Design a binder for these strands. Structure first.
Ligand SMILES: [K+]
Ligand SMILES: [K+]
Ligand SMILES: [K+]
Ligand SMILES: [K+]
Ligand SMILES: [Mg+2]
Ligand SMILES: [Mg+2]
Ligand SMILES: [Mg+2]
Ligand SMILES: [Mg+2]
Ligand SMILES: [Mg+2]
Ligand SMILES: [Mg+2]
Ligand SMILES: [Mg+2]
Ligand SMILES: [Mg+2]
Ligand SMILES: [Mg+2]
Ligand SMILES: [Mg+2]
Ligand SMILES: [Mg+2]
Ligand SMILES: [Mg+2]
Ligand SMILES: [Mg+2]
Ligand SMILES: [Mg+2]
Ligand SMILES: [Mg+2]
Ligand SMILES: [Mg+2]
Ligand SMILES: [Mg+2]
Ligand SMILES: [Mg+2]
Ligand SMILES: [Mg+2]
Ligand SMILES: [Mg+2]
Ligand SMILES: [Mg+2]
Ligand SMILES: [Mg+2]
Ligand SMILES: [Mg+2]
Ligand SMILES: [Mg+2]
Ligand SMILES: [Mg+2]
Ligand SMILES: [Mg+2]
Ligand SMILES: [Mg+2]
Ligand SMILES: [Mg+2]
Ligand SMILES: [Mg+2]
Ligand SMILES: [Mg+2]
Ligand SMILES: [Mg+2]
Ligand SMILES: [Mg+2]
Ligand SMILES: [Mg+2]
Ligand SMILES: [Mg+2]
Ligand SMILES: [Mg+2]
Ligand SMILES: [Mg+2]
Ligand SMILES: [Mg+2]
Ligand SMILES: [Mg+2]
Ligand SMILES: [Mg+2]
Ligand SMILES: [Mg+2]
Ligand SMILES: [Mg+2]
Ligand SMILES: [Mg+2]
Ligand SMILES: [Mg+2]
Ligand SMILES: [Mg+2]
Ligand SMILES: [Mg+2]
Ligand SMILES: [Mg+2]
Ligand SMILES: [Mg+2]
Ligand SMILES: [Mg+2]
Ligand SMILES: [Mg+2]
Ligand SMILES: [Mg+2]
Ligand SMILES: [Mg+2]
Ligand SMILES: [Mg+2]
Ligand SMILES: [Mg+2]
Lengths: 69, 381, 72
RNA sequence: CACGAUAGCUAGGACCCAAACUGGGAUUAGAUACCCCACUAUGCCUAGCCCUAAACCCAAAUAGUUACAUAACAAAACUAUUCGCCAGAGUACUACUCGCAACUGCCUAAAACUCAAAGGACUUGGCGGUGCUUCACAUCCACCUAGAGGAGCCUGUUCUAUAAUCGAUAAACCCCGAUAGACCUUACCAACCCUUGCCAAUUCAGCCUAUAUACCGCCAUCUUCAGCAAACCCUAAAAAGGAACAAUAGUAAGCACAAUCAUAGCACAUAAAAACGUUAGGUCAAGGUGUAGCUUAUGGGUUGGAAAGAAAUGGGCUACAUUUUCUACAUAAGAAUAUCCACCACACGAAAGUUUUUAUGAAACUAAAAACCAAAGGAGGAUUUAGCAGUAAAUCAAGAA
RNA sequence: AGUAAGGUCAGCUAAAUAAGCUAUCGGGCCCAUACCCCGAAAAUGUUGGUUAUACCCUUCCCGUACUACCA
RNA sequence: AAUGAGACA
């Protein structure tokens, strides 16, 4: 929402409790595809209404941010 | 240049596969008593790869001659110094002359798969909704006239369909049809959002001279071809079954109903309105043609809606393909990271926009060819 | 001034009084539907009383009235 | 438990008059609104129901005190006993639930979700188709004179056009930078040449390359508006404000106005002046320069060429005559005068255009004179500009380059 | 199938004395837009015949409309 | 006499 404008890389996952919720991917660049396993934290993104989870980088199928090479 | 493109390992490796495949085609045909149905398929494939295999072989011979240049420069004599500088400095340039022919023809003959390019394209421009005032509406007029002048530079045909001016001297929305030989080819990557950053000069926004950012959306939709229904007795099955109603002896002893079944599609059209089968048969044929024609139109609508609701997106600054910064006199495309100065000439069409499009198409070919070479490995692995 | 709150409550009441008018007959169906379930649930409560007391049938002369019924 | 304005419902009765709804008229782009006319429910009486209000004196009942003491504003502050109510804002006088002669109803009254605020009072400024009083000497109305918009021509913009500059572009642009472009100027285009490429030196010269939204300079503008800024003091606190002449918290300096100076007496008048700020106003193209970009090229030189006006508009000159035209001449003259016609031929008005010649210049495409030619124009639609006295208007002359 | 029946400015109407309103184009008013004021342009579906044309008839074309019943 | 403000603290 204004005055902050960008393209935030989010994802939609179904948690272990069966509910389906919207999550956010921190960092720059990711290789997440459909039917991948990730781990979600309980943080919140201030700019995006509704989003209330963040994927923790470095666990399961999502790795750390890759340094420019 | 073309020499750098060949030096990529993907391009050399793929041509090796063609060389191995082309030789393999000869071995199977000459030796194995291949069946006639299979033999012709290999023969057709053999002819297709005949120019490709020969091109790569000439590259290898040309590359080996370069290795001679390195060896000659190693063994240097005082008398041989003059000879090598008068020959190796000329052979290497001569070699660089020949490799251009081989590499350019490879991409001029491969020709990644292309479609459409011979259908009239409708160009739609609107007024983005990101900022108040006429800063976005006024900017829409300038780019609309940019393409109109650009069409005359490309010797195309411009056909105005809709034109709705705004209150404060602007374009709320517009649409036009452009006909030509390479319309959709060139005007393929121009669809998106064109952001503008300028200090207001003419219009309602001129009351306060502070830099403002606005956006506008351009929609490029390829219009489909014509429609002509083709029907024949091979495609229609007519069941002359009876009907239900109230006619006494007449209904009980008459098959006054027609059930038209379209064999290719499976549609069932039944007409049992009038008393005579001739009247029922006449109407049934008319209805089947009308219903089939409606299906084609609805197919066209789905294709266009699925495309025009993609480029539009949500109409936000976050999505954009080109930014017009009049404050610093730069026009930059985000895809190719190419920046152009002198926006004054850029907005008048001509060579300003044509130069930008050339790199957009070359980048498109580069991405498709590079992936295909890897996809050749994927098919080989 | 406080008029910034009375006007906000004015618009909401004015819009609600049009939501009722537009869908007046939809509320009529639901209100009667809830009244039937209100009466039926009341019958089951009275039916539970005599069954748990050991009786097989309701006491003679007892017909449960329809309290949630339009009368005057 | 009993009651509860007004609107509303059920049954009967009354109906002067007012009057939602409705119909007509008018206004308006539309007016199912304000304004005008007609008439119904109803306002009324008897019997029953509904139980809602800014039901607000927004201040609960009973006893008291004027002690302590000013958040703000208002209707000054507080103690004792007791009850009711209040736990961010929006969602919400809503959803679901209990009761009700209510059935589009009343009472009770949440949550999911969204935001980091919502809200009370005050201060200064701006604005007000808010009221009171006073005033516009080119001024808003009343009112005076001469003009623009109509026609030709000259010139400047927009658009059209070309291979062929740039900048100004509500008041504060439009004979503007230019008190000035045939080459030059020139920054533009098409070709063709040159790479320590003006200087004493320099791994540097050069750039009319981008940025007036990085700027100095030089200004426009409100503006012939009177206020700006620094030192200091006061306020039961200070955001800010600071005057009463029979004077009640202000003081003396700086800038501006004023005075003075110029236009060869004074006076008046006109010039000249007009601060701090406002419009990121105009100017990287007077020149300089920050930052960014070019470096055998966005640099330098040579030759030739930037035509053309479908159309629209602004500012001007000359007119459309009789207060005129022509000649003589300073202002006391003669003659002509759109009409008559048996034929003719004729007024005002070409600045334009054709031809010839002269002046400047290497080059005439530029200017001027003469001959020929006599077209639009018969006082100009909505609208609009200027002037308060030697001013408007008419007429003449010189200078800047 | 038959019958009925219509085409007029960009749009919709009335007349054939081709008009009225709107839209469109140009200008004014306003800080700008709209309203408003001023000026201009604009058409008889199609062919043939109707003294000659038009309102008429005919041909072509589009579209509109009713009916298709007793066994 | 209806309408207008965007990326100024
Ligand atoms: K005030
Ligand atoms: K004029
Ligand atoms: K020259
Ligand atoms: K500079
Ligand atoms: Mg966090
Ligand atoms: Mg925050
Ligand atoms: Mg791990
Ligand atoms: Mg582990
Ligand atoms: Mg707005
Ligand atoms: Mg609300
Ligand atoms: Mg009551
Ligand atoms: Mg009452
Ligand atoms: Mg009553
Ligand atoms: Mg009732
Ligand atoms: Mg009654
Ligand atoms: Mg009455
Ligand atoms: Mg009356
Ligand atoms: Mg009326
Ligand atoms: Mg009261
Ligand atoms: Mg109260
Ligand atoms: Mg009370
Ligand atoms: Mg009490
Ligand atoms: Mg008492
Ligand atoms: Mg008391
Ligand atoms: Mg105070
Ligand atoms: Mg509290
Ligand atoms: Mg809450
Ligand atoms: Mg209520
Ligand atoms: Mg309620
Ligand atoms: Mg005046
Ligand atoms: Mg005059
Ligand atoms: Mg004129
Ligand atoms: Mg002119
Ligand atoms: Mg110009
Ligand atoms: Mg300009
Ligand atoms: Mg240059
Ligand atoms: Mg400035
Ligand atoms: Mg003084
Ligand atoms: Mg003097
Ligand atoms: Mg004086
Ligand atoms: Mg002066
Ligand atoms: Mg003075
Ligand atoms: Mg500016
Ligand atoms: Mg201005
Ligand atoms: Mg400027
Ligand atoms: Mg410079
Ligand atoms: Mg410039
Ligand atoms: Mg510099
Ligand atoms: Mg050059
Ligand atoms: Mg004109
Ligand atoms: Mg002037
Ligand atoms: Mg004269
Ligand atoms: Mg005389
Ligand atoms: Mg004459
Ligand atoms: Mg004359
Ligand atoms: Mg002449
Ligand atoms: Mg509007």
């Amino acid at each position: 929402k204004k005055p902050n404008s960008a393209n935030r890389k989010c994802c939609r996952v179904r948690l272990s409790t069966g509910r389906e919720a919207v999550c956010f991917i921190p960092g720059e660049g990711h290789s997440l595809q459909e039917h991948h396993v990730v781990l979600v934290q309980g943080g919140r993104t201030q700019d995006l209404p509704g989003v209330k989870l963040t994927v923790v980088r470095g666990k399961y199928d999502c790795g750390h941010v890759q340094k420019k090479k | 240049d073309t020499k750098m493109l060949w030096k990529h390992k993907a391009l050399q490796k793929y041509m090796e596969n063609l060389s191995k495949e082309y030789q393999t085609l000869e071995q199977c045909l000459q030796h194995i008593p291949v069946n006639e149905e299979n033999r012709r398929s290999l023969n057709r494939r053999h002819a297709e790869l005949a120019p490709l295999a020969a091109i790569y072989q000439e590259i290898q011979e040309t590359e080996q001659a370069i290795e001679e240049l390195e060896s000659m420069c190693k063994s240097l004599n005082k008398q041989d110094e003059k000879q090598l500088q008068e020959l190796a400095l000329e052979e290497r340039q001569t070699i660089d002359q020949k490799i251009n022919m081989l590499y350019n023809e490879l991409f001029q003959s491969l020709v990644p798969k292309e479609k459409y390019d011979k259908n009239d394209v409708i160009l739609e421009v609107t007024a983005g909704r990101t900022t108040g005032g006429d800063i976005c509406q006024q900017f829409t007029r300038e780019i609309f006239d940019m393409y109109q002048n650009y069409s005359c530079y490309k010797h195309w045909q411009f056909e105005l369909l809709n034109y709705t001016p705004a209150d404060y001297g602007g374009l709320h929305h517009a649409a036009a049809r452009i006909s030509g030989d390479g319309v959709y080819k060139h005007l393929k990557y121009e669809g998106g959002i064109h952001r503008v950053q300028r200090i207001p000069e003419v219009g309602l926004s001129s009351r306060m001279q502070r830099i403002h950012t606005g956006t506008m959306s351009v929609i490029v939709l390829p219009q489909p071809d014509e429609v002509d229904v083709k029907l024949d007795p091979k495609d229609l099955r007519i069941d002359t079954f009876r009907a239900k109603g109230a006619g006494g002896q007449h209904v009980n002893k008459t098959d006054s109903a027609v059930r038209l079944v379209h064999i290719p599609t499976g549609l069932v059209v039944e007409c049992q309105q009038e008393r005579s089968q001739i009247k029922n048969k006449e109407i049934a044929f008319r209805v089947l043609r009308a219903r089939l024609y409606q299906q084609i139109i609805e197919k066209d609508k789905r294709q266009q809606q699925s495309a025009r609701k993609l480029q539009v997106g949500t109409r936000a600054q976050s999505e954009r393909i080109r930014t017009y910064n009049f404050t610093q006199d730069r026009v930059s495309d985000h895809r190719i990271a190419y920046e152009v100065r002198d926006i004054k000439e850029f907005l008048c069409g001509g060579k300003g926009l044509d130069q930008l499009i050339q790199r957009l198409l070359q980048s498109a070919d580069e991405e498709a060819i590079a992936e295909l070479l890897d996809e050749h490995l994927k098919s080989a692995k | 001034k406080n008029i910034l709150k009375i006007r906000r409550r004015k618009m909401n009441h004015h819009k609600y009084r049009k939501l009722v008018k537009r869908t007046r007959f939809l509320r009529r169906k639901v209100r009667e539907g809830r009244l039937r379930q209100k009466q039926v649930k009341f019958e089951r409560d009275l039916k539970r009383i005599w069954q748990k007391a050991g009786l097989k049938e309701a006491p003679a002369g007892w017909q449960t009235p329809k309290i949630y019924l339009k009368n005057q």
